[PDB]
Design a protein around this ligand. Structure first.
Ligand SMILES: [Cl-]
Ligand SMILES: [Cl-]
Ligand SMILES: [Cl-]
Ligand SMILES: [Cl-]
Ligand code: NA
Ligand code: NA
Ligand code: NA
Ligand code: NA
Lengths: 141, 140
């Protein structure tokens, strides 16, 4: 019934949320890394933050596969799902590369990566996909 | 009645998302701020990021008022809403404080603010609130 899109919706939202939480944690580690260069570091360490980003990026993978493996209503759009996955893989892959750049100390290459564009592209599909499902709500009446 | 729920969940989830983006942009600005002090600045500038964070923090405040104005079903717990609002106000106000600290060059107070705890507290209520509406959706 209409419960199969609400459960598929919740699964993709949890991926969306974990991607954002991962990007934020990485940028915290960037500040601490910067602080350590000038020996003014305090609070959370780079290692603890990198450790947390690694965890939430794996959580992101697992949340994604949980959404992929959920059944799709025949009315939904196949192209829509492929565009979601295309933008997700770029965004997820970009965060994985940010972990490597920071570990190698490439702070400029880290900061200059156009992560915002990858995120904007995924959010554009998520929003459009949220709208098409909200319409299946309005017509399932 | 079921439509009333999906509207609330979407309005509150939009606030949740905007809070996360606001915090991330502020942490991007913190890096560039430190880059400027070390003369290795590149990418997005502090000013552009600060005006982005200022922008998204207003989207958060608006997205919240949209959720708060939507009608609450009687079956929904009033105390649950008060706890969502309490944790939201702490979290929002904390992000507003980060804008003041970074604009004042206070990078240590900026980094040391326990923002994670404010976010964890709001996410705890947000998760509990959704699981309740989901069980409510199941009954109907
Ligand atoms: Cl570099
Ligand atoms: Cl970009
Ligand atoms: Cl300070
Ligand atoms: Cl904390
Ligand atoms: Na939403
Ligand atoms: Na500076
Ligand atoms: Na910019
Ligand atoms: Na309050």
């Amino acid at each position: 019934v209409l419960q199969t899109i609400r459960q598929q919706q919740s699964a993709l939202n949890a991926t969306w949320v974990e991607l954002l939480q991962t990007r934020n944690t990485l940028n915290r580690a960037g500040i601490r890394w910067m602080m350590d260069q000038s020996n003014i570091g305090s609070g959370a360490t780079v290692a603890e933050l990198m450790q947390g980003a690694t965890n939430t990026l794996k959580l992101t993978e697992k949340n994604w596969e949980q959404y992929e493996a959920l059944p799709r209503d025949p009315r939904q759009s196949e192209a829509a799902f492929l565009e979601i996955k295309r933008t997700y893989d770029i965004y997820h892959g970009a965060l994985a590369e940010l972990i490597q750049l920071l570990g190698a100390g490439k702070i400029n290459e880290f900061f200059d990566q156009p992560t915002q564009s990858y995120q904007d592209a995924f959010e554009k599909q998520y929003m459009a996909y949220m709208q098409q499902n909200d319409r299946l709500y309005d017509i399932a009446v």
